[PDB]
């Protein structure tokens, strides 16, 4: 399949070179997989989700996304127009309030919830968890992400928007999960993106058009936008039988475009997510 005039981030992960505008992908489109979006919630009624999204857990008064951050990330995962895996199943877990904030104890509970809730869902091709959140270092938050990964879920987390070493931020500094950095459309490291030896992969993170609350769309930037690119790609690759949850991050790194990015500090990988699609 080929989506013309696609968002630049989708066209980037299906090309060996920047500047293209078509997103080439296999028609399976992550069908059979499930992706948990642990964020501010999802506007599941958005037409771009085609009824493939639903809220399963909230830690606040309502399950509605009163912010838009979680709806935007879910749209990059698997919306019809702006998603990597356009046929995947989307589950929303609201651990952040409508201001985009949340206590670590609630974030830890949301991860432990996903590790158990996946056992009563029908996801034959695999389960993915996308965490576009983070803060200061916490060994309890890192351990919760490691538990979720060990239970059999592909965990993708954002590296942070501090332009610093991600080793001082959680759950980005957990080695067992897949930490995602951000890049722009000219194959430059996003000026805000964190770095360090803990980063596994980079994704499109600057000026990312996706869904928004109120049935709308908008473009924002952050490593919170690059993470759903890797999460959606994982669900896309697992549906193809190429990899599994325990080794998706390593497979994505092994098959990535190497050496394409600029302004990458020494000690940080120069790897850009890529689906290796061939018609
Ligand atoms: Ca290249
Ligand atoms: Ca890692």
């Amino acid at each position: 399949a080929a989506q013309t005039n696609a968002p630049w981030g989708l066209a980037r992960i299906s090309s060996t070179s920047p500047g293209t505008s078509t997103y080439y992908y296999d028609e399976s489109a992550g069908q059979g997989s499930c992706v948990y979006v642990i964020d501010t919630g999802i506007e599941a009624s958005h037409p771009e989700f085609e009824g493939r999204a639903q809220m399963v857990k909230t830690y606040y008064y309502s399950s509605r996304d009163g912010n838009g951050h979680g709806t935007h990330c879910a749209g990059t995962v698997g919306s019809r127009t702006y998603g990597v895996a356009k046929k995947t199943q989307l589950f929303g877990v609201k651990v952040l309030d409508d201001n985009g904030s949340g206590q670590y104890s609630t974030i830890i509970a949301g991860m432990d919830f996903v590790a158990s809730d996946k056992n009563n869902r029908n996801c034959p091709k695999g389960v993915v968890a996308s965490l576009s959140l983070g803060g200061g270092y916490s060994s309890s938050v890192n351990s919760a992400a490691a538990r979720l990964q060990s239970s059999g879920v592909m965990v993708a987390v954002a590296a942070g928007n501090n332009n610093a070493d991600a080793r001082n931020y959680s759950p980005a500094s957990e080695p067992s999960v897949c930490t995602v950095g951000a890049s722009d459309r000219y194959d430059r490291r996003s000026s805000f993106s964190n770095y360090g030896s803990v980063l596994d992969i980079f994704g499109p993170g600057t000026d990312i058009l996706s869904t928004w609350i109120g049935g709308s769309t908008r473009s924002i930037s952050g490593t919170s936008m690059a993470t759903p690119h890797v999460a959606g790609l994982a669900a896309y690759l697992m549906t193809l039988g190429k990899t599994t949850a325990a080794s998706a991050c390593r497979y994505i790194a092994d098959t990535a475009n190497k050496g394409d990015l600029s302004n990458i500090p020494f000690g940080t990988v120069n790897l850009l997510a890529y689906n290796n699609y061939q018609a």
Side-chain angles (χ1 to χ4, degrees), residues 45 88 110 209 256:
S45 65
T88 190
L209 180 70

Side-chain angles (χ1 to χ4, degrees), residues 12 15-18 187 257 259-260:
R12 189 64 193 92
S15 176
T16 55
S17 61
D187 281 356
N257 284 315
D260 279 3

